[PDB]
């Protein structure tokens, strides 16, 4: 996260760290959607341009974390993966269309003050919250700058940007399965997700029922926090039918 702030304790209890076993490093962000299901970006697990093709046994999910590097004894819970499910129409060749993946945990995770799942939106929550100017929140342990790393989880609030403005900021073709967020150069305020934030959640707090919903997944951008550029997110509600199908099994 570039131009964010340290998260408060228990501020994002659905935050998941995707951790590579060997070498021991941060792979991606992710999110807790139930006691056994974790949501992430498909490119965190499969990205042929960079020779990325992780299997279940190559990683661990670390839940309830605040510190990036330390082992949070009595706080975080580390889980092993039973199965990875990548969207069958995930487009890694061009624009990361349908950049979404589900991960089934071997054992259910126990909820605590630091571990709690985020909601997934219904058609109405999505229609009412996914509006240009409405702010969401992005969290992660990614790069603090484009060209270092935070000690603790970082947070940034960012407004959803109008579809024409997103499309006009880039040469990449944008689909209905993505949305962009961030401030314009004129707005004053700054902020963006960056490398290592991928797979993390873009959340919004419903003013109707006061619950947090995951509206986006950190997907891509061109650099980080560049003027006239915006971060792109997987549109979760557009792919909820695939999510439901995999969970229903």
């Amino acid at each position: 996260i570039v131009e964010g702030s340290d998260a408060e304790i228990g501020m994002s209890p659905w935050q998941v760290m995707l951790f590579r076993k060997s070498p021991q490093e941060l792979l991606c962000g992710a999110s807790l959607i139930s006691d056994r299901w974790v949501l992430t970006a498909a490119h965190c697990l499969l990205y042929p341009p960079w020779d990325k093709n992780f299997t279940e046994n190559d990683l661990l999910v670390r839940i309830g974390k605040h510190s990036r590097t330390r082992y949070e004894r009595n706080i975080e819970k580390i889980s092993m993966l039973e199965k990875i499910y990548i969207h069958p129409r995930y487009n890694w060749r061009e624009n990361l269309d349908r950049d979404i993946a589900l991960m089934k945990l071997k054992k259910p995770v126990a909820f605590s003050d630091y571990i709690h799942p985020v909601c997934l939106p219904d058609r109405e929550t999505a229609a009412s919250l996914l509006q240009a100017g409405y702010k969401g929140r992005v969290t992660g342990w990614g790069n603090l700058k484009e060209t270092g790393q935070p000690s603790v989880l970082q947070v940034v609030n960012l407004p959803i940007v109008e579809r024409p403005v997103c499309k006009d900021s880039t040469r990449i073709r944008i689909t209905d399965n993505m949305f962009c967020a961030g401030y314009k150069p004129d707005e004053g305020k700054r902020g963006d997700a960056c490398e290592g934030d991928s797979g993390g959640p873009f959340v919004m707090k419903s003013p109707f029922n006061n619950r947090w919903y995951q509206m986006g997944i950190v997907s891509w951008g061109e650099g980080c926090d560049r003027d006239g550029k915006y971060g792109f997110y997987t549109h979760v509600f557009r792919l909820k039918k695939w999510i439901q199908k995999v969970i229903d099994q």
Partner: peptide, 27 residues
């Protein structure tokens, strides 16, 4: 279910430092 309600915030009726910025944006 109890999704999206944080034990240290909504469950305690405590607000985090910036959530009001999100609410104020929902015009």
């Amino acid at each position: 279910a109890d999704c999206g309600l944080r034990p240290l915030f909504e469950k305690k009726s405590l607000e985090d430092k910036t959530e009001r910025e999100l609410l104020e944006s929902y015009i």
